[PDB]
Design a protein around this ligand. Structure first.
Ligand SMILES: Cc1cc2nc3c(=O)[nH]c(=O)nc-3n(C[C@H](O)[C@H](O)[C@H](O)COP(=O)(O)OP(=O)(O)OC[C@H]3O[C@@H](n4cnc5c(N)ncnc54)[C@H](O)[C@@H]3O)c2cc1C
Ligand SMILES: NC(=O)c1ccc[n+]([C@@H]2O[C@H](COP(=O)([O-])OP(=O)(O)OC[C@H]3O[C@@H](n4cnc5c(N)ncnc54)[C@H](OP(=O)(O)O)[C@@H]3O)[C@@H](O)[C@H]2O)c1
Length: 540
């Protein structure tokens, strides 16, 4: 029993469609499967007000950089979701990729057949296809999660998670006009932070329910003249080479200097300039020791904090938005268009819901431990189940009928962030130990799929039909990803990222759900392994 397809690719976001294009371009049989109507993933699903890149548009647009759609015109330095969706669409045209996809179809299970070295893939609990290789491009941040919060279904008004905003026939979102409504927004991650200022322009009243402020910096978006766009296009080969060489694939790189290498007065001048220029420079061009040295982090934390107080006129309000939990740049930093100034409006109220938690949602509004709020509308900007989440929702079974869920219970275990022992011929793209959290995913995802294609090509060419990490390679990779991660300041910030298992005999295993070496050093490890005939995989 031999498989119908060389590969199934799950997902039609930017990673999936590109992976599918490469496999077919290499002369192989691929089937792509997508739950939504059409291409885009993130940019198909997220139609909330303010949705917009945090990556420079020309940097994220790997399909333009690579010469698949070089003629592409960006209208803004940080494109909005609608523009991003037209981008993914136009690229799906050039790649002629849609004819390889089933849409409106959800993978519900995937079972590795040991005797036949193949994957049985189940579609909406009915049809079953077979493939040599299973490749998930299921997304690091798809799979919305609701707040665990009592009474959700009683609200008598309109109610959404931010990733499921209803639209008109044209694709444009509806119920965007809040004129004369009282609006609740729960959550202040990068999603809430984009919505709240747009909500505030039309809402009669606006309540923001914040469990934990983030460090947010100004985005500094503006339009992109045709002249500048032509200029960028002309230097695409330089820009590409440059983003392939930085640690995050953003067009920034760390200052060579330590924080304490300049006076206090020089830091401030330096911080002041980056703060004012657009994009992630303030975070990504910082001092080399920004995420490794408590004191060097406090310099910048102190500085952004001072900026929050300058921008928010009310001092009690302003201190509630300054975080005390965590170091700056310890999470993907949300960037904003007039976020703080919004709280100077008369119709906008910040509700600290850590000191006074929500009890329940009510037919009339929301109820906290010390107040009630009549609300006409509620927006759940409460985030996603990250990296591993979209995989958990598929019943994935490997050798010996073992659940991926159970294999990764003590935390994700991979080789190269790409395969897992127990799960042969299975590739996880922009999953764990891969670096997604701080990546320009447009670029990182792209390069990861090219590497997977090269390994698939190698096997076809050698007539191999079996690949799986050795236990030793996977142990060494996984331990090493953790060691590097323990050396930065992210370790005591987000301890939920670390899973710690004191087994029953006394042994202690530590895994992080997050890779933090640079992309270049990652890709270098992958090429050393690829060239040395995939040293670390059993290949047969
Ligand atoms: C609002 C938002 C803004 C972002 N902005 C940036 C940014 O500016 N820069 C950056 O680098 N990153 C950004 N990201 C991260 C983002 O995840 C990546 O840029 C990128 O879009 C991920 O692409 P992907 O193809 O890997 O996954 P996705 O875009 O998440 O697509 C995965 C697809 O798989 C589908 N799927 C999942 N399970 C199944 C199944 N069981 N069966 C069938 N289909 C399934 C989903 O429907 C989805 O379409 C942003 C993310 C969000 C949510
Ligand atoms: N390019 C962009 O501008 C952009 C835009 C959107 C998203 N993204 C990406 O998507 C990721 C997720 O961002 P997100 O804003 O969608 O989600 P998120 O960052 O995880 O934030 C969810 C928010 O809801 C709050 N929340 C979670 N559970 C809650 C509960 N049970 N009750 C009340 N409040 C709760 C969280 O608070 P706690 O911290 O207390 O849990 C948090 O502030 C980001 O890291 C970013 O990488 C990027």
């Amino acid at each position: 029993k031999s498989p119908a397809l060389d590969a199934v690719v799950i997902g039609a976001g930017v990673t999936g469609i590109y992976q599918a294009f490469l496999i077919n371009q290499a002369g192989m049989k691929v089937l792509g499967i997508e739950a939504g109507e059409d291409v885009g993933g993130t940019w198909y699903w997220n139609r909330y007000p303010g949705c917009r890149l945090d990556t420079e548009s020309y940097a994220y647009g790997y399909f333009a950089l690579k010469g698949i759609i070089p003629e592409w015109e960006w209208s803004e330095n940080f494109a909005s979701q609608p523009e991003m969706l037209r981008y993914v669409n136009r690229a799906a045209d050039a790649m002629d990729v849609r004819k390889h996809y089933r849409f409106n179809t959800r993978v519900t299970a995937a079972r590795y057949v040991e005797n036949d070295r193949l994957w049985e893939v189940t579609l909406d609990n009915e049809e079953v296809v077979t493939c040599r290789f299973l490749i998930s491009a299921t997304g690091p941040l798809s799979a919305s999660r609701m707040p665990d919060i009592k009474g959700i279904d009683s609200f008598k008004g309109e109610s959404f998670h931010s990733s499921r905003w209803p639209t008109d026939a044209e694709g444009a979102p509806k119920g965007v006009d809040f004129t004369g409504k009282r609006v609740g927004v729960i959550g202040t991650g990068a999603t809430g932070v984009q919505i709240i200022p747009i909500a505030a322009e039309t809402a009669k009243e606006l309540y923001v329910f914040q469990r934990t402020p983030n460090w947010c910096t100004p985005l500094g978006n503006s339009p992109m003249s045709k002249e500048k766009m032509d200029s960028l296009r002309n230097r695409y080969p330089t820009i590409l080479e440059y983003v392939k060489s930085t640690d995050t694939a953003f067009p920034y790189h760390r200052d060579p200097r330590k924080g304490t290498d300049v006076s206090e007065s020089e830091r401030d001048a330096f911080f002041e300039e980056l703060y004012r220029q657009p994009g992630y420079g303030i975070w990504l061009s910082g001092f080399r020791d920004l995420l490794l040295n408590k004191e060097s982090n406090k310099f910048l934390a102190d500085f952004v904090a001072k900026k929050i107080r300058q921008r928010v006129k009310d001092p009690v309000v302003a201190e509630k938005l300054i975080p005390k939990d965590h170091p700056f740049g310890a999470k993907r930093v949300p960037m904003e268009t007039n976020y703080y100034e919004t709280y100077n409006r008369d119709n906008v109220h910040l509700v600290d819901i850590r000191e006074a938690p929500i009890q329940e949602v009510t037919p009339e509004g929301i109820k906290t431990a010390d107040a009630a709020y009549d609300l006409d509308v509620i927006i759940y900007a409460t985030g996603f189940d990250a990296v591993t989440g979209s995989l958990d929702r598929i019943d994935i079974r490997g050798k010996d009928n073992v659940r991926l869920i159970d294999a990764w219970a003590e935390g994700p275990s991979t080789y190269l962030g790409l395969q897992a022992r127990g799960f042969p011929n299975f590739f996880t793209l922009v999953g764990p130990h891969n670096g997604s959290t701080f990546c320009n995913v447009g670029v990182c995802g792209g390069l990861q799929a090219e590497w997977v294609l090269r390994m698939i090509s190698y096997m076809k060419d050698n007539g191999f039909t079996y690949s799986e990490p050795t236990q030793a390679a996977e142990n060494r990779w996984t331990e090493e990803v953790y060691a590097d991660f323990s050396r930065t300041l992210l370790a005591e910030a987000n301890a939920w990222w670390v899973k710690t298992t004191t087994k029953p005999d006394g042994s202690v295993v530590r895994r992080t759900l997050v890779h933090v070496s640079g992309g270049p050093e990652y890709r270098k490890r992958c090429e050393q392994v690829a060239y040395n005939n995939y040293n670390g995989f059993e290949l047969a």
